[PDB]
Amino acid sequence: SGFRKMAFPSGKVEGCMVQVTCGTTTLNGLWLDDVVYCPRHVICTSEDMLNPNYEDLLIRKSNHNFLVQAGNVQLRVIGHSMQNCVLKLKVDTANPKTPKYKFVRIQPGQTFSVLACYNGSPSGVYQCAMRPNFTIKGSFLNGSCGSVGFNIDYDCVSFCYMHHMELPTGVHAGTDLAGNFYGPFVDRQTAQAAGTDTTITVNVLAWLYAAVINGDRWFLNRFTTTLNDFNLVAMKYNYEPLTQDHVDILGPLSAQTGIAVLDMCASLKELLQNGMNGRTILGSALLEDEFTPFDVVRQCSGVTFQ
Amino acid sequence: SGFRKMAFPSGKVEGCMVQVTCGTTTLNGLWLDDVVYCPRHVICTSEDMLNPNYEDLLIRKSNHNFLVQAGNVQLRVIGHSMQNCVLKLKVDTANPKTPKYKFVRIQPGQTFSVLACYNGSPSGVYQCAMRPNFTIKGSFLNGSCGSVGFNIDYDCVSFCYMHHMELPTGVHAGTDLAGNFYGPFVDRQTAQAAGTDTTITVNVLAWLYAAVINGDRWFLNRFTTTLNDFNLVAMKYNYEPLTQDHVDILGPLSAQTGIAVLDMCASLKELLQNGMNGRTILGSALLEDEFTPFDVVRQCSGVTFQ
Numbered sequence A, B: 001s002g003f004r005k006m007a008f009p010s011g012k013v014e015g016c017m018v019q020v021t022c023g024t025t026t027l028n029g030l031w032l033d034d035v036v037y038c039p040r041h042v043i044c045t046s047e048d049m050l051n052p053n054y055e056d057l058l059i060r061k062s063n064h065n066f067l068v069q070a071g072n073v074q075l076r077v078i079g080h081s082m083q084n085c086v087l088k089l090k091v092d093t094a095n096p097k098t099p100k101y102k103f104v105r106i107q108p109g110q111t112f113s114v115l116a117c118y119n120g121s122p123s124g125v126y127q128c129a130m131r132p133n134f135t136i137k138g139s140f141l142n143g144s145c146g147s148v149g150f151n152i153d154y155d156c157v158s159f160c161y162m163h164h165m166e167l168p169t170g171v172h173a174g175t176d177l178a179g180n181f182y183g184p185f186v187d188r189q190t191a192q193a194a195g196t197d198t199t200i201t202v203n204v205l206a207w208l209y210a211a212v213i214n215g216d217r218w219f220l221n222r223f224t225t226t227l228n229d230f231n232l233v234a235m236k237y238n239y240e241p242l243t244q245d246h247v248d249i250l251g252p253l254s255a256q257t258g259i260a261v262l263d264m265c266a267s268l269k270e271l272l273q274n275g276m277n278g279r280t281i282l283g284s285a286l287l288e289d290e291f292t293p294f295d296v297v298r299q300c301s302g303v304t305f306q
């Protein structure tokens, strides 16, 4: 037992992290086969980042302007090209540590592991969810750009996120590995607002199931509710509407615990309307929404990767 | 900005994890140079674990009873010996992935990263603190024994924890890498109680400093308090007494924020006596105590490892 916010083991990604320096900008790149991916705002100066035209900026660059360091070994850039908001630097060596991988774009509500990195050196690993407003609540300082987010499914790393920037609220924005931003953001140093967030309803329910699996049962009840009447409570507390496919994906957890999905909704309704009254659930005094049904089933069952 | 519970990158440890099977017990071992370390209760049967005499049990074992698998490659056991509650299995290959390492015993209040492992395959990574009662609030299922806990300081892995067992409250107990248990526990399947816990006071204060660094300031005040009068509040709420060395270690954080340590204690006092009134601190509705002053300074400054 126990329930922790748990990231994937990071080793396979650590082996791909490199340092990319252009001019007076240094950030991280991701080295897979003979390509290094990194955020395109590395080509910019401090007064370039204020309103840049990246095509104009990149045609003035050459291969030798890109210093790529795989630890203490310099990689030679032999080509460069821009794909949306990422740069693809072709180097003269293939990464011998290249894992089996995919580039996948995730849905809001889904989770991933972030390997925070500085100067090409991994610093820490933690779990994040893609918020409904396409931001992520991360931990990122100067020089963390190009750190990636990922999931691991057996031996294959599915990269879903590259870090680009921090919004004024202290949340973080970035792209998939094809360089397309999550959300209505641009890699420009001007004011941009995140869009109003919501709580990920199906994730809260999954976490309640994790709690029951772990022996927290004080919030259970013999009441029930229709899906329709749950959602009138949901909109009232800025929770996402629940769909029948969310009920279906909660099916296995419903089955293991013997608590019908709609019964657990009645419990969530009561927690929303009354609060917790000085109690906790899995060591939290808040309703937690950054665990997916998948996350619960992995941790409360025990899947591995090789 | 941002503040996350952040583990060390796990790659260096992933390369040391192996599967150890004896009889009908399988668990994880830690493979460093030509030795595999694992919990000694692997030699036991189901009715051995109820009241075992381990010296008697081990003299009846031989090298060939220990099946060690480094992935899909079998390691050959050429010696075995018992050091307290761990076994040391000498194998015929040195691990070529052996990091620079140390075996260190940590103090309650200190934190470390756990690489949860099943069948020799790493499953996830997360952060833990050693509770004042020498337990840890982990996430561990059947077969997770032998997963280790560690810190990383530049290139050197300091191993501090090996997992052995789960107490009836759902907390976890284990040993340092010399096989000496943390706390008054034995590797015996009988009832054992954890001892009463306390909150790690200096850690809460460090986390309040992390919050200020990140822009949560609503709990600040212009009141102050003497160290003496803070501790009368501390014992009242089951918090650890604060010492002058805790004030000293909080010095740098005190300096960056400009909030005197004793001023922050006055704030903690008020949070203890009034609660939070529907507000959060760094996304938590509870006072968090599993971040050390070191943890705050790493995350709010950005140290790496290579």
Ligand SMILES: *[C@H](O)[C@H](C[C@@H]1CCNC1=O)NC(=O)[C@@H]1[C@@H]2[C@H](CN1C(=O)[C@@H](NC(=O)CC(C)C)C(C)(C)C)C2(C)C
Pocket: A027, A041, A049, A140, A141, A142, A143, A144, A145, A146, A164, A165, A166, A167, A168, A172, A186, A187, A188, A189, A190, A191, A192, B001
């Ligand atoms: C790249 O490592 C860096 C990572 C930032 C620094 C602090 N925390 C982070 O996540 N990104 C940038 O510096 C980013 C590039 C310049 C300005 N950038 C910012 O993130 C800005 N943020 C904004 O100007 C506001 C948003 C809407 C852009 C700050 C945090 C440095 C002020 C690019 C080209 C956007």
Ligand SMILES: *[C@H](O)[C@H](C[C@@H]1CCNC1=O)NC(=O)[C@@H]1[C@@H]2[C@H](CN1C(=O)[C@@H](NC(=O)CC(C)C)C(C)(C)C)C2(C)C
Pocket: A001, B027, B041, B049, B140, B141, B142, B143, B144, B145, B146, B164, B165, B166, B167, B168, B172, B186, B187, B188, B189, B190, B191, B192
């Ligand atoms: C080893 O992988 C396993 C890990 C446990 C299983 C569930 N969660 C864990 O952390 N350890 C053991 O099975 C452990 C060995 C036998 C009994 N063990 C237990 O942890 C017991 N716990 C107790 O009997 C109570 C404590 C005081 C020992 C349970 C959880 C399996 C009932 C050893 C020799 C103690």
